[PDB]
Coordinates of N, CA, C and O (backbone and C1' of nucleotides) in Angstrom, one line a residue:
Chain A
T2 N -109.4 -40.2 28.8 CA -108.0 -40.4 29.3 C -107.1 -39.1 29.0 O -106.7 -38.5 30.0
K3 N -106.8 -38.8 27.8 CA -106.0 -37.6 27.5 C -106.8 -36.3 27.6 O -107.9 -36.3 27.2
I4 N -106.1 -35.2 28.0 CA -106.7 -33.9 28.1 C -105.8 -32.8 27.6 O -104.6 -32.8 27.9
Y5 N -106.2 -31.9 26.7 CA -105.5 -30.9 26.1 C -106.0 -29.5 26.5 O -107.1 -29.1 26.1
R6 N -105.1 -28.7 27.1 CA -105.3 -27.2 27.3 C -105.0 -26.4 26.1 O -103.8 -26.3 25.8
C7 N -106.0 -25.8 25.5 CA -105.8 -25.0 24.3 C -106.0 -23.6 24.6 O -107.1 -23.2 25.0
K8 N -105.0 -22.7 24.3 CA -105.2 -21.3 24.3 C -105.4 -20.8 22.9 O -104.6 -21.2 22.0
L9 N -106.4 -20.1 22.7 CA -106.9 -19.6 21.4 C -106.5 -18.1 21.4 O -107.0 -17.4 22.2
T10 N -105.7 -17.6 20.5 CA -105.4 -16.1 20.3 C -106.0 -15.6 19.0 O -105.7 -16.3 18.0
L11 N -106.7 -14.5 19.0 CA -107.4 -14.1 17.8 C -106.4 -13.4 16.8 O -105.7 -12.4 17.2
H12 N -106.3 -13.8 15.6 CA -105.4 -13.3 14.6 C -106.1 -12.4 13.5 O -105.4 -11.6 12.8
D13 N -107.4 -12.4 13.5 CA -108.2 -11.3 13.0 C -109.5 -11.3 13.8 O -109.8 -12.3 14.5
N14 N -110.3 -10.2 13.7 CA -111.5 -10.0 14.6 C -112.5 -11.1 14.4 O -112.8 -11.4 13.2
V15 N -113.1 -11.7 15.4 CA -114.1 -12.8 15.4 C -115.5 -12.2 15.6 O -115.8 -11.6 16.6
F16 N -116.4 -12.5 14.6 CA -117.8 -12.1 14.7 C -118.7 -13.3 14.7 O -118.6 -14.2 13.8
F17 N -119.7 -13.4 15.6 CA -120.8 -14.3 15.6 C -122.1 -13.5 15.9 O -122.0 -12.6 16.8
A18 N -123.2 -13.6 15.1 CA -124.4 -12.8 15.4 C -125.2 -13.3 16.6 O -126.4 -13.7 16.5
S19 N -124.6 -13.4 17.8 CA -125.1 -14.1 19.0 C -126.3 -13.5 19.5 O -127.2 -14.2 19.9
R20 N -126.5 -12.1 19.6 CA -127.7 -11.5 19.8 C -127.8 -10.2 18.9 O -126.8 -9.7 18.4
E21 N -129.0 -9.8 18.5 CA -129.2 -8.8 17.5 C -130.2 -7.8 18.0 O -131.2 -8.1 18.6
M22 N -129.8 -6.5 17.9 CA -130.4 -5.4 18.6 C -130.4 -4.2 17.6 O -129.4 -3.5 17.5
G23 N -131.5 -4.0 16.9 CA -131.6 -3.0 15.9 C -130.5 -3.2 14.7 O -130.4 -4.3 14.3
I24 N -129.8 -2.2 14.4 CA -128.7 -2.2 13.4 C -127.5 -2.9 13.9 O -126.7 -3.3 13.1
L25 N -127.3 -3.2 15.2 CA -126.1 -3.8 15.8 C -126.3 -5.3 16.2 O -127.3 -5.6 16.8
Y26 N -125.4 -6.1 15.7 CA -125.3 -7.5 15.9 C -124.1 -7.8 16.8 O -123.0 -7.1 16.5
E27 N -124.1 -8.6 17.8 CA -123.0 -8.7 18.7 C -122.6 -10.1 19.1 O -123.3 -11.1 19.1
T28 N -121.3 -10.3 19.5 CA -120.6 -11.5 19.7 C -120.5 -11.7 21.2 O -119.9 -10.9 21.9
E29 N -121.0 -12.9 21.7 CA -120.8 -13.2 23.1 C -119.4 -13.5 23.5 O -118.6 -14.0 22.7
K30 N -119.0 -13.2 24.7 CA -117.6 -13.3 25.2 C -117.2 -14.8 25.5 O -116.2 -15.0 26.1
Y31 N -118.0 -15.8 25.1 CA -117.7 -17.2 25.2 C -117.8 -17.9 23.9 O -118.9 -17.7 23.3
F32 N -116.8 -18.6 23.4 CA -117.0 -19.4 22.2 C -117.7 -20.7 22.6 O -117.3 -21.4 23.4
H33 N -118.9 -20.8 22.0 CA -119.7 -22.0 22.2 C -119.0 -23.3 21.7 O -118.3 -23.4 20.7
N34 N -119.2 -24.4 22.5 CA -118.7 -25.6 22.3 C -118.9 -26.2 20.9 O -118.0 -26.7 20.3
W35 N -120.1 -26.1 20.4 CA -120.5 -26.8 19.1 C -119.8 -26.1 18.0 O -119.2 -26.7 17.1
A36 N -119.6 -24.7 18.1 CA -118.9 -24.0 17.1 C -117.4 -24.3 17.1 O -116.8 -24.5 16.0
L37 N -116.8 -24.5 18.3 CA -115.4 -24.9 18.3 C -115.2 -26.3 17.8 O -114.3 -26.5 17.2
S38 N -116.1 -27.2 18.1 CA -116.0 -28.6 17.7 C -115.9 -28.7 16.2 O -115.1 -29.4 15.6
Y39 N -116.7 -28.0 15.5 CA -116.7 -28.0 14.0 C -115.5 -27.2 13.5 O -115.0 -27.5 12.4
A40 N -115.1 -26.2 14.2 CA -113.9 -25.5 13.8 C -112.6 -26.3 13.9 O -111.7 -26.2 13.1
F41 N -112.5 -27.2 14.9 CA -111.4 -28.1 15.0 C -111.4 -29.3 14.1 O -110.4 -29.7 13.5
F42 N -112.6 -29.9 14.0 CA -112.8 -31.3 13.4 C -113.6 -31.3 12.1 O -113.7 -32.4 11.5
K43 N -114.1 -30.3 11.5 CA -114.7 -30.3 10.2 C -113.7 -30.4 9.1 O -112.6 -29.7 9.2
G44 N -113.9 -31.3 8.2 CA -112.9 -31.7 7.2 C -112.0 -32.9 7.6 O -111.7 -33.8 6.9
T45 N -111.5 -32.8 8.9 CA -110.6 -33.9 9.4 C -111.4 -35.1 9.9 O -111.0 -36.3 9.7
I46 N -112.6 -34.9 10.5 CA -113.5 -35.9 11.0 C -114.9 -35.8 10.5 O -115.5 -36.6 9.9
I47 N -115.6 -34.6 10.9 CA -117.0 -34.4 10.4 C -116.9 -34.1 9.0 O -116.0 -33.4 8.6
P48 N -117.8 -34.5 8.1 CA -117.8 -34.1 6.8 C -117.9 -32.6 6.5 O -118.6 -32.0 7.3
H49 N -117.4 -32.0 5.4 CA -117.5 -30.5 5.1 C -118.0 -30.3 3.7 O -117.3 -30.1 2.7
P50 N -119.4 -30.5 3.5 CA -120.0 -30.3 2.2 C -119.9 -28.9 1.7 O -120.4 -28.0 2.4
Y51 N -119.3 -28.5 0.6 CA -119.3 -27.1 0.2 C -120.7 -26.6 0.0 O -121.0 -25.6 0.6
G52 N -121.6 -27.3 -0.7 CA -123.0 -26.7 -0.9 C -124.0 -27.3 0.0 O -123.9 -28.5 0.4
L53 N -125.1 -26.6 0.2 CA -126.4 -27.1 0.8 C -127.6 -26.5 0.0 O -127.6 -25.4 -0.4
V54 N -128.6 -27.3 0.0 CA -129.9 -27.0 -0.8 C -131.1 -27.6 -0.1 O -131.0 -28.6 0.5
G55 N -132.3 -27.0 -0.2 CA -133.5 -27.4 0.5 C -133.5 -27.0 1.9 O -132.7 -26.1 2.4
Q56 N -134.2 -27.8 2.8 CA -134.3 -27.5 4.2 C -133.0 -27.5 4.9 O -132.7 -26.8 5.9
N57 N -132.1 -28.4 4.4 CA -130.7 -28.5 4.9 C -129.9 -27.2 4.8 O -128.8 -27.1 5.4
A58 N -130.3 -26.2 4.0 CA -129.6 -25.0 3.9 C -130.0 -24.0 5.0 O -129.3 -23.0 5.2
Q59 N -131.1 -24.2 5.7 CA -131.6 -23.4 6.8 C -131.7 -24.0 8.2 O -131.8 -23.4 9.2
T60 N -131.7 -25.4 8.2 CA -131.9 -26.2 9.4 C -130.6 -26.7 9.9 O -129.9 -27.4 9.1
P61 N -130.1 -26.5 11.1 CA -128.9 -27.1 11.6 C -128.9 -28.6 11.7 O -130.0 -29.3 11.7
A62 N -127.8 -29.3 11.9 CA -127.8 -30.8 12.0 C -126.9 -31.2 13.1 O -126.3 -32.3 13.0
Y63 N -127.0 -30.6 14.2 CA -126.0 -30.8 15.2 C -126.0 -32.2 15.7 O -125.0 -32.8 15.8
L64 N -127.2 -32.8 16.0 CA -127.3 -34.1 16.6 C -128.3 -34.9 15.8 O -129.1 -35.6 16.4
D65 N -128.2 -34.9 14.5 CA -129.0 -35.7 13.6 C -128.1 -36.7 13.0 O -127.2 -36.4 12.4
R66 N -128.4 -38.0 13.2 CA -127.5 -39.1 12.8 C -127.7 -39.4 11.3 O -126.8 -40.0 10.7
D67 N -128.7 -38.9 10.7 CA -128.9 -39.1 9.2 C -128.1 -38.0 8.4 O -127.6 -38.4 7.4
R68 N -128.0 -36.8 9.0 CA -127.3 -35.8 8.2 C -125.9 -36.0 8.4 O -125.4 -36.6 9.3
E69 N -125.1 -35.4 7.5 CA -123.7 -35.6 7.5 C -122.9 -34.8 8.5 O -122.1 -35.3 9.2
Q70 N -123.2 -33.5 8.6 CA -122.5 -32.7 9.5 C -123.1 -32.8 10.9 O -124.0 -32.1 11.2
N71 N -122.6 -33.8 11.6 CA -123.1 -34.1 12.9 C -122.0 -34.1 13.8 O -121.0 -34.5 13.5
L72 N -122.3 -33.7 15.1 CA -121.2 -33.6 16.1 C -121.1 -35.0 16.7 O -120.3 -35.2 17.5
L73 N -122.0 -35.9 16.4 CA -122.1 -37.2 17.0 C -121.0 -38.0 16.4 O -120.6 -39.0 17.0
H74 N -120.4 -37.7 15.3 CA -119.3 -38.3 14.8 C -118.2 -38.2 15.8 O -117.4 -39.2 16.0
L75 N -118.1 -37.1 16.5 CA -117.1 -36.9 17.5 C -117.3 -37.8 18.7 O -116.4 -38.2 19.3
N76 N -118.6 -38.0 19.1 CA -118.8 -38.9 20.2 C -118.2 -40.2 19.9 O -117.6 -40.8 20.7
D77 N -118.2 -40.6 18.6 CA -117.7 -41.9 18.2 C -116.2 -41.9 18.2 O -115.6 -42.9 18.7
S78 N -115.6 -40.8 17.8 CA -114.1 -40.8 17.8 C -113.6 -40.6 19.2 O -112.4 -40.6 19.4
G79 N -114.5 -40.4 20.1 CA -114.2 -40.2 21.5 C -113.5 -39.0 21.8 O -112.4 -39.0 22.2
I80 N -114.0 -37.8 21.3 CA -113.4 -36.5 21.6 C -114.5 -35.6 22.2 O -115.7 -35.7 21.7
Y81 N -114.2 -34.6 23.0 CA -115.2 -33.6 23.5 C -114.5 -32.3 23.8 O -113.6 -32.3 24.7
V82 N -114.8 -31.2 23.2 CA -114.2 -29.9 23.5 C -115.2 -29.3 24.4 O -116.3 -29.7 24.4
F83 N -114.8 -28.4 25.3 CA -115.7 -27.8 26.3 C -115.8 -26.4 25.6 O -115.2 -26.2 24.6
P84 N -116.7 -25.5 26.2 CA -116.8 -24.2 25.6 C -115.6 -23.4 26.0 O -114.8 -23.9 26.8
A85 N -115.4 -22.2 25.5 CA -114.2 -21.4 25.8 C -114.3 -20.2 26.7 O -115.1 -19.3 26.5
Chain B
rA1 O5' -125.6 -26.9 12.0 C5' -124.5 -27.7 11.4 C4' -124.3 -27.3 10.0 C3' -123.6 -26.0 9.7 O3' -122.3 -26.2 9.6 C1' -125.6 -26.2 8.4
rC2 P -121.3 -24.9 9.6 O5' -121.5 -24.2 11.0 C5' -121.7 -25.0 12.1 C4' -121.2 -24.3 13.4 C3' -121.6 -22.8 13.4 O3' -121.8 -22.5 14.7 C1' -119.2 -23.1 13.2
rU3 P -123.3 -22.7 15.3 O5' -123.8 -21.2 15.5 C5' -125.1 -20.8 15.3 C4' -125.3 -19.4 15.8 C3' -124.4 -18.3 15.2 O3' -125.0 -17.7 14.1 C1' -124.4 -18.2 17.6
rG4 P -124.1 -16.9 13.1 O5' -123.6 -17.9 12.0 C5' -122.4 -18.6 12.2 C4' -122.2 -19.7 11.1 C3' -122.3 -19.2 9.7 O3' -121.2 -18.6 9.2 C1' -123.5 -21.2 10.0
rA5 P -121.2 -17.7 7.9 O5' -121.6 -18.7 6.7 C5' -120.8 -19.7 6.2 C4' -121.5 -20.3 5.0 C3' -121.5 -19.3 3.8 O3' -120.4 -19.3 3.0 C1' -123.7 -20.3 4.1
rA6 P -119.3 -18.1 3.0 O5' -120.1 -17.0 2.1 C5' -120.0 -17.0 0.7 C4' -120.8 -15.8 0.2 C3' -120.4 -14.4 0.7 O3' -119.3 -13.9 0.0 C1' -122.8 -14.7 0.6
rA7 P -118.3 -12.9 0.8 O5' -119.2 -11.7 1.2 C5' -119.7 -10.8 0.1 C4' -120.5 -9.7 0.7 C3' -119.6 -8.7 1.5 O3' -120.0 -7.4 1.2 C1' -121.3 -9.5 2.8
rC8 P -119.7 -6.7 -0.2 O5' -118.9 -5.4 0.2 C5' -117.9 -5.4 1.2 C4' -117.2 -4.1 1.4 C3' -118.2 -3.0 1.8 O3' -117.7 -2.1 2.7 C1' -117.1 -2.4 -0.2
rG9 P -117.5 -2.6 4.2 O5' -117.4 -1.4 5.2 C5' -118.5 -0.6 5.6 C4' -118.8 0.4 4.6 C3' -117.7 1.5 4.4 O3' -117.8 1.9 3.1 C1' -119.7 2.5 4.9
rA10 P -116.7 2.6 2.3 O5' -117.4 2.7 0.9 C5' -117.3 1.7 -0.1 C4' -118.3 2.0 -1.2 C3' -118.1 3.4 -1.8 O3' -117.3 3.4 -2.9 C1' -120.3 3.2 -1.1
rU11 P -116.7 4.7 -3.5 O5' -118.0 5.4 -4.2 C5' -118.5 5.1 -5.4 C4' -119.8 6.0 -5.7 C3' -119.4 7.4 -5.8 O3' -118.9 7.6 -7.1 C1' -121.3 7.2 -4.5
rU12 P -117.6 8.5 -7.3 O5' -118.0 10.0 -7.2 C5' -118.9 10.6 -8.1 C4' -119.3 12.0 -7.6 C3' -118.2 12.8 -7.1 O3' -117.5 13.4 -8.1 C1' -120.1 13.0 -5.7
rG13 P -115.9 13.7 -7.9 O5' -115.9 15.0 -7.0 C5' -116.5 16.2 -7.4 C4' -116.8 17.1 -6.2 C3' -115.5 17.6 -5.6 O3' -115.6 19.0 -5.4 C1' -117.0 16.8 -3.9
rU14 P -115.1 20.1 -6.6 O5' -113.6 20.4 -6.2 C5' -112.6 19.4 -6.0 C4' -111.2 20.0 -5.8 C3' -111.1 20.8 -4.5 O3' -109.8 20.7 -4.0 C1' -110.7 22.2 -6.4
rU15 P -109.5 19.7 -2.8 O5' -109.6 20.8 -1.5 C5' -108.5 21.4 -0.9 C4' -108.8 22.9 -0.7 C3' -107.5 23.7 -1.0 O3' -107.9 24.8 -1.7 C1' -108.5 24.4 0.9
rG16 P -106.9 25.4 -2.8 O5' -108.1 26.3 -3.5 C5' -109.2 25.6 -4.1 C4' -110.5 26.5 -3.9 C3' -110.2 27.9 -4.3 O3' -110.1 28.0 -5.7 C1' -111.5 27.7 -2.3
rU17 P -109.3 29.3 -6.3 O5' -110.6 30.2 -6.1 C5' -110.4 31.6 -6.3 C4' -111.6 32.3 -5.7 C3' -111.2 33.7 -5.4 O3' -111.3 34.5 -6.5 C1' -112.3 32.8 -3.5
rG18 P -109.9 35.0 -7.3 O5' -109.6 36.3 -6.4 C5' -110.2 37.5 -6.7 C4' -109.7 38.5 -5.7 C3' -108.2 38.6 -5.7 O3' -107.7 39.4 -6.7 C1' -109.0 38.5 -3.5
rC19 P -106.2 39.5 -7.2 O5' -105.5 40.1 -5.9 C5' -105.6 41.5 -5.6 C4' -105.0 41.8 -4.3 C3' -103.5 41.7 -4.3 O3' -103.0 42.7 -3.6 C1' -104.4 40.4 -2.6
rC20 P -102.5 44.1 -4.4 O5' -101.0 43.7 -4.8 C5' -100.6 42.8 -5.7 C4' -99.1 42.8 -6.0 C3' -98.2 42.8 -4.8 O3' -97.0 42.1 -5.2 C1' -97.9 44.8 -6.0
rC21 P -96.6 40.7 -4.6 O5' -95.8 41.1 -3.3 C5' -94.3 41.2 -3.3 C4' -93.8 42.4 -2.7 C3' -92.6 43.1 -3.3 O3' -92.9 44.4 -3.2 C1' -92.3 42.8 -1.0
rC22 P -92.4 45.4 -4.4 O5' -93.2 46.7 -4.1 C5' -94.6 46.8 -4.2 C4' -95.2 47.5 -3.1 C3' -94.5 48.8 -2.7 O3' -95.1 49.9 -3.5 C1' -94.8 47.5 -0.7
rU23 P -94.1 50.8 -4.3 O5' -93.8 52.0 -3.2 C5' -94.8 52.9 -2.8 C4' -94.5 53.3 -1.4 C3' -93.2 54.1 -1.2 O3' -93.4 55.4 -1.6 C1' -93.5 52.6 0.6
rG24 P -92.5 56.0 -2.8 O5' -92.0 57.4 -2.1 C5' -91.5 57.5 -0.8 C4' -90.2 58.1 -0.7 C3' -89.4 58.0 -2.0 O3' -88.8 59.2 -2.2 C1' -88.2 57.1 -0.2
rG25 P -87.7 59.4 -3.4 O5' -86.3 59.2 -2.6 C5' -85.8 60.1 -1.7 C4' -84.5 59.7 -1.1 C3' -83.4 59.4 -2.2 O3' -82.2 59.8 -1.8 C1' -83.7 57.6 -0.8
rC26 P -81.6 61.2 -2.1 O5' -80.8 61.1 -3.4 C5' -81.1 60.3 -4.5 C4' -80.0 60.4 -5.6 C3' -78.7 59.7 -5.2 O3' -78.1 59.2 -6.4 C1' -78.4 62.0 -5.4
rG27 P -78.4 57.7 -6.8 O5' -77.1 56.9 -6.2 C5' -75.9 56.7 -7.0 C4' -74.8 57.4 -6.3 C3' -73.8 58.0 -7.3 O3' -73.4 59.2 -6.8 C1' -72.6 56.8 -5.7
rG28 P -73.1 60.5 -7.7 O5' -72.9 61.5 -6.5 C5' -73.9 61.9 -5.7 C4' -73.5 62.0 -4.2 C3' -72.3 62.9 -4.1 O3' -72.7 64.3 -4.1 C1' -72.1 61.0 -2.7
rU29 P -71.8 65.3 -4.9 O5' -70.7 65.5 -3.7 C5' -71.0 66.2 -2.6 C4' -69.9 66.1 -1.5 C3' -68.5 66.5 -2.1 O3' -68.4 67.9 -2.0 C1' -68.3 64.5 -0.8
rC30 P -67.9 68.8 -3.2 O5' -66.3 68.7 -2.9 C5' -65.7 69.5 -1.9 C4' -64.2 69.1 -1.9 C3' -63.6 69.2 -3.3 O3' -63.2 70.5 -3.5 C1' -62.9 67.2 -2.2
rG31 P -62.8 71.1 -5.0 O5' -61.5 70.3 -5.4 C5' -60.3 70.7 -4.9 C4' -59.2 69.7 -5.3 C3' -59.0 69.8 -6.8 O3' -57.6 69.7 -7.1 C1' -59.5 67.6 -6.1
rC32 P -56.7 71.0 -7.1 O5' -56.6 71.5 -8.6 C5' -57.7 71.3 -9.5 C4' -57.3 71.6 -11.0 C3' -56.3 70.6 -11.5 O3' -56.3 70.6 -13.0 C1' -55.2 72.7 -11.2
rU33 P -57.6 69.8 -13.7 O5' -56.9 69.3 -15.0 C5' -56.1 68.1 -15.1 C4' -54.6 68.4 -15.1 C3' -54.1 69.3 -16.2 O3' -53.0 70.1 -15.8 C1' -52.9 67.3 -16.2
rU34 P -52.7 71.5 -16.4 O5' -51.5 71.9 -15.3 C5' -51.9 72.2 -14.0 C4' -50.9 71.6 -13.0 C3' -49.5 72.1 -13.2 O3' -49.3 73.4 -12.6 C1' -49.5 69.8 -12.5
rU35 P -48.3 74.3 -13.3 O5' -46.9 73.6 -13.0 C5' -46.2 73.7 -11.8 C4' -45.0 72.7 -11.8 C3' -44.0 73.2 -12.8 O3' -43.2 74.3 -12.3 C1' -44.2 70.8 -12.7
rC36 P -42.9 75.6 -13.2 O5' -41.7 75.2 -14.1 C5' -40.4 75.1 -13.5 C4' -39.5 74.4 -14.5 C3' -39.4 75.0 -15.9 O3' -38.6 76.1 -16.0 C1' -39.6 72.6 -16.1
rA37 P -39.1 77.3 -16.9 O5' -38.5 76.9 -18.3 C5' -37.1 76.6 -18.4 C4' -36.9 75.7 -19.6 C3' -37.1 76.3 -21.0 O3' -35.9 76.1 -21.8 C1' -38.2 74.2 -20.9
rA38 P -34.7 77.1 -21.9 O5' -35.1 78.1 -23.1 C5' -36.3 78.8 -23.2 C4' -36.5 79.7 -24.3 C3' -36.5 79.0 -25.7 O3' -37.2 79.7 -26.7 C1' -34.5 80.3 -25.3
rU39 P -38.8 79.6 -26.8 O5' -39.1 79.7 -28.3 C5' -39.1 78.7 -29.3 C4' -37.7 78.6 -30.0 C3' -37.3 79.9 -30.9 O3' -35.9 79.9 -30.8 C1' -37.4 78.0 -32.3
rG40 P -35.0 81.3 -30.7 O5' -33.5 80.8 -30.8 C5' -32.7 80.6 -29.6 C4' -32.0 79.3 -29.6 C3' -30.8 79.2 -30.6 O3' -29.7 79.9 -30.0 C1' -32.1 77.3 -30.7
rC41 P -29.3 81.3 -30.5 O5' -28.0 80.9 -31.4 C5' -27.1 80.1 -30.8 C4' -26.5 79.0 -31.6 C3' -26.1 79.5 -33.0 O3' -24.8 80.1 -33.0 C1' -27.2 77.4 -33.1
rC42 P -24.7 81.8 -33.0 O5' -23.8 82.1 -34.2 C5' -22.6 81.4 -34.5 C4' -22.5 81.0 -36.0 C3' -22.9 82.0 -37.0 O3' -21.9 83.0 -37.1 C1' -23.8 80.0 -37.6
rU43 P -22.2 84.5 -37.6 O5' -22.7 84.3 -39.1 C5' -21.9 84.8 -40.1 C4' -22.3 84.2 -41.4 C3' -23.1 85.0 -42.4 O3' -22.2 85.8 -43.2 C1' -24.2 82.9 -42.1

RNA sequence: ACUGAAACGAUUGUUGUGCCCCUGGCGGUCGCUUUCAAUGCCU
């Protein structure tokens, strides 16, 4: 039902290691949706565990309902950010 | 796990060595301490 137009302005330089080519790592010109969803709603809705250990330190949990940091919590709150 | 977690382009480095504000030069030239004068007066 409700829709929000968000303009994002960079207040310091943004880096993501989106592709990697020798000594240089580079940031794609689109902010991915799942990155923005956790940037908006981690701590407020999705849990924000300071520490990770074991396989959970190297394996993502985007759509795992057992793990805490899931974007599926947002499905439930009925929110969806599109990419940028 | 935000294409995630941590993330010092860092360490050492003398704008440095040599160098005369130097060489030449007359405070010079002209100039009368001048002018006037009873060792006087009376014995």
